[PDB]
RNA sequence: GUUAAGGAACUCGGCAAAAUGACCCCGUAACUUCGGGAGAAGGGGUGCUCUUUAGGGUUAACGCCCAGAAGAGCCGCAGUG
RNA sequence: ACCUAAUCAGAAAGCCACGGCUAACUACGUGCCAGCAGCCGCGGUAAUACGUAGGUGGCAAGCGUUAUCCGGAAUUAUUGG
RNA sequence: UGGAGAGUUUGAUCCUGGCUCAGGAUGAACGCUGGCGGCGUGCCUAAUACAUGCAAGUCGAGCGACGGCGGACGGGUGAGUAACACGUGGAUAACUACCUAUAAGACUGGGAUAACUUCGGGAAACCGGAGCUAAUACCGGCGAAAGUGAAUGUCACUUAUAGAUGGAUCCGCGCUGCAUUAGCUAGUUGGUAAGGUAACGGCUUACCAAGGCAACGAUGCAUAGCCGACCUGAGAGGGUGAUCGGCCACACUGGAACUGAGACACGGUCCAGACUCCUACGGGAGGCAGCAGUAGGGAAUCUUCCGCAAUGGGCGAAAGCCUGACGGAGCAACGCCGCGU
């Protein structure tokens, strides 16, 4: 507004918040690295084999994996692709991005470098799922 | 380890100045007692030796050379 | 005082110099005082000697120690 | 002369401080002990940042005392503080260091580690 | 000493011996909004024999340090009014 | 009246005893009806001799009583001994 | 570093997409299922919007995905409400 | 010189208005595939204990059979500090192993002792004793003074100069978030006193004196090395602090010193604390945020490489000598560039 008021208080701009909460900050030090920052990726360790549904009008079935992350906290997940060589308490790489119409799930289990290593059943969409073909 | 031999000078160079310094100051601490009596016998001809040890702020350079005038600036 | 110095620059497999002068307390790479001009080491598609003795005589008055391979510039 | 409910310092870095006494191990009806006997302590005070927490039944050995022992030559010894060392299930101390002069009596071939850690004995 | 900077300003209060405070005016420009704005640091000043009173316009020279903020040195009396 | 090591293990129950106690200082929480809490708690100092100076009243004044400060020094296990 | 002379075009190319945006389409299998999704969402009996071969488009010794930051956002706007 | 848009609330509109996508980035990770000439950058997460190697010496024209200059430059790191730490312009109350320009004078007179053989104790760190000796070592008269050697020349000593060089210091301005934090320090603010360091100084102490700061942000909390620059942008601005240069602080932790020209000293030092490990359990040793490599939390960052030829630095009058500064190589599509199949 008035140039008198703008001297007396500047434009304190709009804060934003992260779309994906449970990563990427200095958390809660407890004389060791009790919890840390994972900007793109991490390890995991699993806790539960997941089976769930979307909720809005949709009626399909989905297979998450409710884990405890490497910084004491609890998140859901998802395995893209077909195969599932995963059981309880097995290491899984992470990468962010929510899943719409599921009520509370958080990230994608990377199908390349983990115990989630390689998914067969795919032949054209490949590097999104970690499937090889050394002929070409 | 060629600073081993530098240590052997360091316990050896403490003796020469701290003898000179403690003789510099008690010749000067008795001097302002002798300058409190002023009979020209216990103050004369050793005050310039109290200034010779304040000239041995240039000879005994442990007391710094530019710091020669930190005490001797009043009596003479 | 000061010492006449060649700041080495230049990429991989190709040095190049700039004639500067500062005290030995200052390092090679930087905190350099003045520059009397460039110097050209390689001679293929490039000159071989470069100096400007106008502001070089300003430093041989208050003292200067040229390195004995830099003095072959100013002997020519 | 230790008793059935006296307190003792602990002279090591095992994560403890002043411990009580519960019972003196040995024969029945036993009422005192001295340098080099086991007891049953309980931790009444602890350093935050240790491996023994407060309120926990542990054993010990009496290492110093204000009473002392009498030796073969008739020599006596008297400390000025009571102290003990928390000992594990087999004979060896739980901590790492020991902050005091242990008694010269203490080993018989048996506590061959507590006398191997004291500043002097 | 002999040639130092000058901050002419009003004398606020003589409250102890050899000590006053000589306030000055400074309108400072803002960074981007353009409209100027006032800031008035109130610097203390040694004066020789309680020569100042409340309200004088003076002339100030600097010196070599004395104590906590007694860093300026009064010179003149341009105005001797109240 | 005193007591080695331990200190409520005594016992219906810390019952009786033991410790705390004066003046001068620093400092003091929750809570509240704003007065209180509060001597809250937890802390320090005190003896004798010698040198200087600032304090009332009495009185013309030497004289007399009332006092508080720093500094220097001495002795004992312990200075409201 | 450079450079000549040799049997040899012979060793030396991927990767994501292809409703609308947004650059690029067809035939079946499953067929509100294994899924997919940046939002509109395409899936109840194939479905140009899911895996598959064909086809094309993009970039190219590199192609996509993530988390983070600025522009898009005139959506903190003095220039600009 | 240069500045785009699309989608979605309704049966259908105009508007306000959010959320969402296309693009540029990464000292990124991870997903598939793999030809490189050539150029760069590769601890950003547990400040998690650091094997084995090399990084500070030099001088046999000191002098004997330690006396000098250098280890205050240089090369690593961001836990600290919201501050003259830094940036930017003003000021003098004073500080040089050096470097140099002229000139002075470089005299006189003495005596103590390491290495070395005996002496005894310790497993050791090594020490107490005794005969032996020079020194350019040591001593006296606003006052100290040096001599040395291949052809006297040369080269350091010493005093007063002033120039460069180098550090110190108060001052104007620039320096993050919060007011759901309003009071704040007491030697605090000031004179005076003598002491105190290169100098000014409440710089540390002593009697008097009643002030400092503040709604123009004083005080207290959590987050942070900072600039030149990097990123994006039409620009104005927003976000960042890495290699690369200038300045700053720190050395497993917390104090304090000593020698010298101007260290509170990374590789020295006495002490105190938590840790490793050996000894005869009487004692002593150890500090890779030097150059790499291993261990460790990790989704994540490399060779235990010969070597001083060039440029730069100590020492010497010179040959040269030590140089993990550096001149370069060993490894990853890590980034741009150029280039083929
Ligand atoms: Mg009470
Ligand atoms: Mg109460
Ligand atoms: Mg080094
Ligand atoms: Mg290097």
């Amino acid at each position: 507004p008035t140039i008198n008021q703008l001297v007396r208080k500047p434009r304190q701009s709009k804060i934003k918040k992260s779309d994906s909460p449970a990563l990427n900050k200095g958390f809660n030090s407890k004389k060791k690295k009790f919890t840390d920052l994972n900007s793109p990726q991490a390890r995991g360790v699993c806790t539960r084999v997941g089976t769930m549904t979307p909720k809005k009008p949709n009626s399909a079935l989905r297979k998450y994996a409710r884990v405890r992350l490497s910084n004491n906290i609890e998140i859901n997940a998802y395995i893209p692709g077909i195969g599932h060589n995963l059981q309880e308490h097995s290491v899984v790489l992470v990468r962010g991005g929510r899943v719409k119409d599921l009520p509370g799930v958080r990230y994608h289990i990377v199908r390349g470098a983990l115990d989630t290593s390689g998914v067969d059943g795919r032949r054209q969409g490949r590097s999104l799922y970690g499937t090889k073909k050394p002929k070409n | 380890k060629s600073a081993i031999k530098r240590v052997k000078t360091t316990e050896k160079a403490e003796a020469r100045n701290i003898s000179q310094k403690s003789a510099m100051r008690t010749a000067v601490k008795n001097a302002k007692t002798a300058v409190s009596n002023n009979a020209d016998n216990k103050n004369e001809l050793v005050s310039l030796a109290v200034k010779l040890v304040d000239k041995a702020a240039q000879s005994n350079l442990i007391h710094s050379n530019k710091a020669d005038r930190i005490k001797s600036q009043l009596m003479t | 005082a000061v010492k006449i110095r060649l700041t080495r620059l230049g990429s991989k497999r190709n040095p190049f110099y700039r004639i500067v002068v500062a005290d030995a307390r200052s390092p090679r790479d930087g905190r350099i005082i003045e520059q009397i001009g460039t110097y050209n080491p390689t001679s293929a598609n490039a000159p071989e000697i470069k100096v400007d003795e106008a502001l070089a005589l300003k430093w041989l008055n208050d003292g200067a120690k040229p390195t004995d391979t830099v003095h072959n510039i100013l002997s020519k | 002369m230790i008793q059935q409910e006296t307190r003792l310092k602990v002279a090591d870095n095992s994560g403890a401080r002043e411990v009580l006494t519960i019972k003196v191990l040995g024969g029945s009806g036993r009422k005192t002990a001295n340098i080099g006997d086991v007891i049953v302590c309980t931790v009444k005070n602890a350093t935050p940042g240790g491996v023994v927490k407060k309120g926990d039944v542990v054993k010990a050995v009496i290492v110093r005392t204000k009473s002392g022992v009498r030796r073969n030559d008739g020599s006596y010894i008297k400390f000025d503080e009571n102290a003990c060392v928390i000992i594990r299930d087999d004979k060896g101390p739980r901590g790492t260091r020991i902050f005091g002069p242990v008694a010269r009596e203490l080993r018989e071939g048996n506590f061959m580690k507590i006398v191997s850690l004291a500043p002097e004995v | 000493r002999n040639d130092r900077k000058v901050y002419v300003g009003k004398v606020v209060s003589d409250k102890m011996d050899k000590t006053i405070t000589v306030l000055v005016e400074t309108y400072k420009t803002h960074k981007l909004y353009g409209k100027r704005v006032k800031y008035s640091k109130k610097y203390k000043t040694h004066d020789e024999n309680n020569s100042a009173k409340l309200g004088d316009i003076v002339k100030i020279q600097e010196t070599r340090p004395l104590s906590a903020t007694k860093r300026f040195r009064l010179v003149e009396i341009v105005e001797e009014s109240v």
Side-chain angles (χ1 to χ4, degrees), chain A residues 1-24 26-29 34-51 53-54 57-100 103-110 112-113 115-136, chain B residues 1 3-17 20-23 25-27 31-32 34 39 45-46 49 53 56-57 59 63 67 70-72 74 76, chain C, chain D, chain E:
Chain A
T2 308
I3 315 294
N4 193 7
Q5 283 181 352
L6 291 173
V7 175
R8 300 192 304 176
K9 55 180 181 294
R11 298 287 189 182
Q12 187 179 4
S13 65
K14 178 175 68 178
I15 58 108
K16 68 180 179 293
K17 65 184 78 68
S18 180
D19 52 358
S20 66
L23 274 55
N24 211 166
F27 298 102
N28 299 114
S29 67
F34 178 76
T35 166
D36 293 328
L37 60 48
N38 296 117
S39 302
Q41 289 176 358
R43 69 175 170 88
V45 64
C46 294
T47 307
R48 181 175 296 172
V49 176
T51 303
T53 55
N58 195 1
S59 297
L61 288 82
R62 292 183 61 87
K63 274 75 178 175
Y64 65 90
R66 173 176 288 179
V67 300
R68 294 177 66 254
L69 192 63
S70 60
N71 302 122
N72 297 109
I73 49 211
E74 185 269 328
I75 51 193
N76 300 115
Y78 179 64
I79 301 100
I82 297 177
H84 299 284
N85 295 113
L86 287 76
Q87 65 180 359
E88 185 181 359
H89 293 291
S90 67
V91 292
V92 286
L93 184 61
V94 310
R95 63 102 173 267
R98 66 180 290 164
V99 172
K100 191 262 181 66
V105 304
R106 192 260 173 191
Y107 71 97
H108 289 172
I109 296 173
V110 185
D115 292 333
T116 311
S117 181
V119 171
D120 290 331
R122 300 301 180 97
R123 288 182 291 273
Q124 185 176 3
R126 291 170 62 194
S127 65
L128 304 182
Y129 298 96
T131 303
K132 293 181 172 65
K133 185 183 76 173
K135 296 182 288 294
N136 266 19
Chain B
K1 302 294 187 293
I4 299 299
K5 300 177 290 296
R6 178 68 66 182
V7 177
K8 299 301 295 296
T9 305
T10 307
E11 288 99 9
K12 190 176 182 182
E14 59 86 19
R16 193 180 72 184
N17 59 6
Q20 180 68 250
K21 285 163 66 178
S22 179
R25 62 187 68 191
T26 62
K32 196 178 287 183
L45 71 151
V46 295
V53 300
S59 297
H63 188 187
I70 75 165
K71 183 58 67 69
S72 67
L74 181 61
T76 179
Chain C
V2 289
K3 292 185 179 183
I4 294 174
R5 177 178 288 107
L6 288 170
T7 296
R8 180 189 175 275
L9 61 97
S11 300
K12 186 173 181 179
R13 296 173 181 173
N14 193 2
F16 186 76
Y17 296 153
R18 288 175 184 165
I19 305 188
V20 297
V21 57
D23 193 77
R25 180 177 171 88
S26 297
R28 181 188 66 190
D29 293 332
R31 200 169 72 185
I32 57 187
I33 300 300
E34 293 292 329
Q35 183 174 1
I36 65 177
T38 62
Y39 184 67
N40 300 317
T42 64
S43 299
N45 292 113
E48 65 271 17
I49 297 294
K50 185 67 177 178
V51 72
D52 291 325
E53 285 181 349
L55 280 75
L57 189 62
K58 188 176 74 175
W59 295 109
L60 274 76
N61 292 319
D62 292 331
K65 181 64 181 293
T67 309
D68 297 332
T69 70
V70 183
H71 192 79
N72 297 113
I73 299 166
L74 302 171
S75 296
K76 300 176 183 190
Chain D
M1 295 180 185
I2 211 68
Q3 205 189 3
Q4 192 268 331
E5 60 98 26
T6 173
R7 293 179 188 270
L8 291 84
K9 288 182 177 181
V10 182
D12 68 355
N13 52 3
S14 178
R17 294 294 183 90
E18 283 79 6
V19 297
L20 195 67
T21 304
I22 293 179
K23 191 62 178 171
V24 174
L25 298 180
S28 296
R30 187 171 183 177
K31 57 184 179 180
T32 60
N34 204 2
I35 297 173
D37 289 332
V38 295
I39 54 194
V40 177
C41 293
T42 174
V43 175
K44 307 292 283 187
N45 189 1
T47 301
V51 300
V52 182
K53 295 296 182 181
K54 185 176 74 175
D56 189 70
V57 173
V58 298
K59 294 184 177 180
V61 289
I62 301 109
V63 161
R64 299 192 294 270
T65 181
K66 292 174 71 173
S67 304
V69 294
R70 183 173 183 267
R71 302 184 188 276
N72 209 164
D73 56 350
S75 296
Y76 293 90
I77 188 153
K78 304 287 195 295
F79 301 98
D80 283 328
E81 189 71 28
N82 302 109
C84 65
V85 170
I86 294 173
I87 270 182
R88 295 177 292 176
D89 301 330
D90 194 75
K91 289 189 283 184
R94 185 174 290 172
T96 302
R97 296 184 297 169
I98 290 164
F99 299 104
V102 305
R104 281 75 182 176
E105 190 273 334
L106 190 61
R107 83 282 199 189
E108 292 165 350
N110 48 9
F111 303 121
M112 295 296 290
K113 291 173 69 176
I114 298 174
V115 303
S116 295
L117 297 176
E120 61 181 3
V121 51
Chain E
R1 292 178 64 87
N2 54 2
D3 193 359
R4 294 290 181 92
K5 297 295 189 294
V6 171
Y7 298 100
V8 169
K10 306 294 185 292
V11 178
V12 176
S13 67
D14 183 70
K15 57 189 174 66
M16 295 188 293
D17 295 333
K18 292 182 180 180
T19 299
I20 59 194
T21 59
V22 182
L23 183 62
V24 291
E25 180 184 0
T26 302
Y27 52 88
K28 293 182 179 182
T29 62
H30 194 270
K31 182 177 183 294
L32 73 98
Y33 285 144
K35 181 173 181 291
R36 59 173 63 91
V37 64
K38 300 292 181 292
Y39 287 105
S40 296
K41 67 183 179 69
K42 181 177 67 178
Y43 56 83
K44 296 188 287 182
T45 297
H46 176 269
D47 52 355
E48 188 174 3
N49 52 8
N50 289 112
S51 294
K53 62 181 182 292
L54 281 73
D56 300 335
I57 293 187
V58 294
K59 178 178 181 293
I60 305 301
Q61 70 191 356
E62 291 176 351
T63 180
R64 66 180 180 179
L66 296 173
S67 67
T69 321
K70 186 177 284 187
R71 175 59 183 167
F72 294 95
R73 181 69 175 89
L74 182 143
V75 182
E76 295 181 356
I77 300 176
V78 175
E79 183 177 3
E80 61 186 1
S81 296
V82 177

